[PDB]
Amino acid sequence: GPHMATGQDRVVALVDMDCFFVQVEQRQNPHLRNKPCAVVQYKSWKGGGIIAVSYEARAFGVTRSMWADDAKKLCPDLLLAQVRESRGKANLTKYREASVEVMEIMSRFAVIERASIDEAYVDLTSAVQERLQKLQGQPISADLLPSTYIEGLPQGQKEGMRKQGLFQWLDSLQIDNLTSPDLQLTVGAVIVEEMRAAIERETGFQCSAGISHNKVLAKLACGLNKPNRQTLVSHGSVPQLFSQMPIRKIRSLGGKLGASVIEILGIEYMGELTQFTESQLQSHFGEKNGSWLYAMCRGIEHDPVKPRQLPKTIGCSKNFPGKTALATREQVQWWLLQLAQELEERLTKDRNDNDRVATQLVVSIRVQGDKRLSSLRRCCALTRYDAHKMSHDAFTVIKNCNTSGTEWSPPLTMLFLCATKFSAS
DNA sequence: ATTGTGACGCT
Numbered sequence A: 001g002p003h004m005a006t007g008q009d010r011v012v013a014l015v016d017m018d019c020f021f022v023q024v025e026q027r028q029n030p031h032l033r034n035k036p037c038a039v040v041q042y043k044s045w046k047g048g049g050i051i052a053v054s055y056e057a058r059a060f061g062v063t064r065s066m067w068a069d070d071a072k073k074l075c076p077d078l079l080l081a082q083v084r085e086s087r088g089k090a091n092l093t094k095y096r097e098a099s100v101e102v103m104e105i106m107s108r109f110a111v112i113e114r115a116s117i118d119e120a121y122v123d124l125t126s127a128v129q130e131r132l133q134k135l136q137g138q139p140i141s142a143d144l145l146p147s148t149y150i151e152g153l154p155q156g157q158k159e160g161m162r163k164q165g166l167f168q169w170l171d172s173l174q175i176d177n178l179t180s181p182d183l184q185l186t187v188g189a190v191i192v193e194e195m196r197a198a199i200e201r202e203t204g205f206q207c208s209a210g211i212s213h214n215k216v217l218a219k220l221a222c223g224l225n226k227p228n229r230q231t232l233v234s235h236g237s238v239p240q241l242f243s244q245m246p247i248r249k250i251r252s253l254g255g256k257l258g259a260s261v262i263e264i265l266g267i268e269y270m271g272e273l274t275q276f277t278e279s280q281l282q283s284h285f286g287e288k289n290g291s292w293l294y295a296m297c298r299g300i301e302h303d304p305v306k307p308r309q310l311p312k313t314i315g316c317s318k319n320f321p322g323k324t325a326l327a328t329r330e331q332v333q334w335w336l337l338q339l340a341q342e343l344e345e346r347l348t349k350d351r352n353d354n355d356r357v358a359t360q361l362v363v364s365i366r367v368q369g370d371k372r373l374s375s376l377r378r379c380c381a382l383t384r385y386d387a388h389k390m391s392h393d394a395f396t397v398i399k400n401c402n403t404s405g406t407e408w409s410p411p412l413t414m415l416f417l418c419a420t421k422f423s424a425s
Numbered sequence B: 001a002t003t004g005t006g007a008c009g010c011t
């Protein structure tokens, strides 16, 4: 009853850019705007692998992880932009820099947690309190929410339905109670409209967002009405929303754990989890996961928005599939040097921009015929931003994997160099 | 022959 805390203390948003790499390329090349297009990596093998797809191209069935040649079968007029290649590998610098543009705008409104190259969580609780006190009890006009959907409304064309649901929501609002969670979410949504307007004005990029009381619901909400819209998921919307929500749609349950929840419990949807005790869930999935699942199926999650705008690691990876797998010593050395040169460039720029230095270098490899994505992972000291030294140390750290009696065997199908353990400088 | 990352948990 009164003592069952409902996890309505916070206002959290998740902002995620729409078809991000495509928008970056469309901004640079106006011929690509408002067209079916996609961004690929490489080009020789089946036209390259697609990593981002405009919404126009998605209507033809083009998806991420498709080969461009196959996508062209679905979409013969598909336009393609290629990721930059430097030193024989994909170079994602243009998109990392675009990301920083967006992150810097978001950071003006509130402390953010970078969650990927194109998305961040925002803790808006303090900003909402400030705005509520500034409103001095003034109601909230629908004009302030021009791109907001209220999940689960209306009850009882697309734009018309959106505005009907928004009117139902706004007429139901108790504007006098500065502590109403629903009001707090609404004011959050007003701020997020302003944030998304600023992002689009100042970068040209459109994005969607979710507003709810925690990160998992905010991330789920964001995807409900993409592209170029934001979605408010209130605490009261959760039972209906979860009643037909496949468990795999929830962040962290899209893999083996979610499959085991489904198989062991004999359920399909998030809402069915409510019928199990906390102890039952802890028994099957462990104490942490069990407590998390017990609260999350009731809409409650406590994971904080971490104050972290910069990546915690800076890494460089390249696959060598099939007959391109590295089978000589000179090959492994040359590719370790290419990787180290890109790493050195990114680290030197990171030091100048962010006043920090990495102190540990992680070397990861895959060997041909190995089932695992990473065969060996070994760390050494990173004492100097020098590509030649980083590559020699990575080699020193992996060389005892070679079983040849000049050659390399088994051949290497992946190299990975990652700088970690940053320290102020 | 999805590839290139990046966060985080387990032991």
Ligand SMILES: Nc1nc2c(ncn2[C@H]2C[C@H](O)[C@@H](COP(=O)(O)NP(=O)(O)OP(=O)(O)O)O2)c(=O)[nH]1
Pocket: A016, A017, A018, A019, A020, A021, A022, A051, A052, A053, A064, A117, A118, A226, A227, B003, B004
């Ligand atoms: N290298 C690489 N980059 C990737 C991969 N997957 C995604 N990216 C890059 C390209 C993506 O643009 C970007 C952001 O990933 P999302 O937010 O998951 N997708 P988006 O913003 O495209 O569309 P939506 O409107 O549905 O959010 O990350 C990958 O497997 N490899």
Ligand SMILES: [Mn+2]
Pocket: A016, A017, A018, A019, A020, A118
């Ligand atoms: Mn995105």
Ligand SMILES: [Mn+2]
Pocket: A016, A017, A116, A118, A119
């Ligand atoms: Mn994203």
